Amino acid sequence: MNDLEKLVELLTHDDSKTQQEAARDLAEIASGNASAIKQVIDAGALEKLVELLTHDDSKVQQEAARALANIASGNDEAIKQVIDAGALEKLVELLTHDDSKVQQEAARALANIASGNDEAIKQVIDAGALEKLVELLTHDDSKVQQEAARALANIASGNDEAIKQVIDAGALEKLVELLTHDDSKVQQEAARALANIASGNTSAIKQVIDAGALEKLQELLTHDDSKVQQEAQRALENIKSG
Question: How far apart are CA 90 and CA 43, in angstroms?
Fold first, then answer.
């Protein structure tokens, strides 16, 4: 049994600090080379990590979700593996327990998965992730709003059938109220999400402007933060040519 696998072993222990530290230490190893990431996978981390998500231990959940997150930042192989290990079911589950840092890692996790191909994107919507995600947009938690928006954006970067789901979940008007929030990153992600949704067809572009996106977006264009401006401008543009 090599070092990595004795870690997956330690995950199976009933001590809180034991699980947490092993989970934490996997979280870091899995945030390096593509090589490090696959070493983690074939060491069988995924079954064990996913099951930690169902222990009601805030700190443990936070490290097991984060680990999944970091693994989902690797290539398409990891993302396929994370999915086949049933993460999405538990991950979306974690979004309903009001736990700042745990909702946060869960979102980034889904978000990252959602950055994969179209097969990955479908599995996210089918796992009921949309409804829960949209809900997190109304929490008074700048960090959570950012990761939730970030996920939707990725998801709204898929096909028509995806964009349509995002609208149907009632994203649009929550997203716009984000544009008025005085946190740079949040605005950045909301605007990005909007910009993507507004790369669909006339139906999709229409429901954006009806949601009052235009004036807020043009408002952000006068803020002093390059990155936000870019996302706003890019947004005003796919709205414009329609």
Answer: 21
Residues contacting 191, CB < 8 A, separation 6+: 179, 217, 220, 228, 231, 232, 234, 235
Cβ atoms of 117 and 91 within 8 Å: the answer is no
| The two three-digit tokens of residue 4, written as one number | 């990595």
Which CATH number is associated with domain 1-242? 1.25.10.10
Angle subtended at Cα 82 by Cα 75 and Cα 89, rounded to the nearest 5 degrees: 140
115 vs 76: CA distance, rounded Å: 10
Alpha-carbon gap, residue 184 to 31, rounded angstroms? 25
C-alpha–C-alpha distance, residues 163 and 94, integer Å: 24
Taking CA atoms, 140 is separated from 12, 149, 181, in Å, by 35, 14, 10
Instruction: Output DSSP code: residue 56.
Output: S
Domain map of the chain by residue range? 1-242
Q: Which two tokens stand for residue 22?
A: 């092993």
Q: In 3D, which of 31, 32, 100 has the Cα closest to residue 68?
A: 31
- Residue 60: which of 93, 14, 29 has the closest Cα? 14
CB 188 within 8 A of CB 231: yes
**What residues contact residue 118 under an 8 Å CB cut-off, 6+ apart?**
158, 159
Burial of 17 per CB tally in 10 Å (0-12, 13-18, 19+): exposed
Q: What is the resolution of this structure in A?
A: 2.8
How was this structure determined? It was done by X-ray
Q: Please, are residues 216 and 175 in contact by the beta-carbon 8 Å criterion?
A: no
